[PDB]
Amino acid sequence: MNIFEMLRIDEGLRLKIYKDTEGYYTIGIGHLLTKSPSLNAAKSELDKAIGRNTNGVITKDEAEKLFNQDVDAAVRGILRNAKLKPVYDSLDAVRRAALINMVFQMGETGVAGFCNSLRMLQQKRWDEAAVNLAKSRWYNQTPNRAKRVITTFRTGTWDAYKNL
Numbered sequence: 334m335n336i337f338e339m340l341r342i343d344e345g346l347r348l349k350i351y352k353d354t355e356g357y358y359t360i361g362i363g364h365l366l367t368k369s370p371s372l373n374a375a376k377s378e379l380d381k382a383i384g385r386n387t388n389g390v391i392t393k394d395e396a397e398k399l400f401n402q403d404v405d406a407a408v409r410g411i412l413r414n415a416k417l418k419p420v421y422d423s424l425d426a427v428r429r430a431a432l433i434n435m436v437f438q439m440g441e442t443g444v445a446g447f448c449n450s451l452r453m454l455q456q457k458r459w460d461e462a463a464v465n466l467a468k469s470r471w472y473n474q475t476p477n478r479a480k481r482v483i484t485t486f487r488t489g490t491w492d493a494y495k496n497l
């Protein structure tokens with residue numbers, strides 16, 4: 334297991350534009366196109382992202398290319414963020430993957446405001462951090478995924494993704 338395999342489990346793979354759990358047009362392995370309700374707007378984003386006129390359908394290789402860019406961007410975003418970089422740097426590689434997963438899902442600003450949980454993670458108070466992380470819109474709206482990410486933070490193991 335690694336961050337790519339973990340996010341591939343959590344995000345799926347679909348090669349046609351679809352709406353994500355928040356109702357937003359997405360494609361590939363969790364590549365958010367736009368929060369606009371216009372499908373045309375989403376197609377335009379997709380064509381810009383891929384570099385050709387797609388009319389809403391991509392290949393598996395294209396989905397993987399966007400996915401690699403999005404994982405890289407999440408990590409780069411963490412390392413440029415004054416609230417996230419210290420916690421990220423304090424973590425082991427498995428827990429770093431859990432933080433990348435959260436930033437991939439909800440964005441840098443979104444995770445950087447989990448300040449109390451970030452402090453508990455910096456403190457390596459893992460059970461406390463897990464309890465605090467669940468007191469969130471994130472957990473309530475995507476509880477199975479959040480439970481997997483939280484288990485990863487609590488244990489520093491991949492047990493929540495074993496058998497997935």
Ligand SMILES: *SCC1=CC(C)(C)N(O)C1(C)C
Binds near residue numbers: 448452
């Ligand atoms: S998100 C910034 C932050 C707030 C507080 C909970 C005081 N912290 O310990 C850090 C710096 C994580």
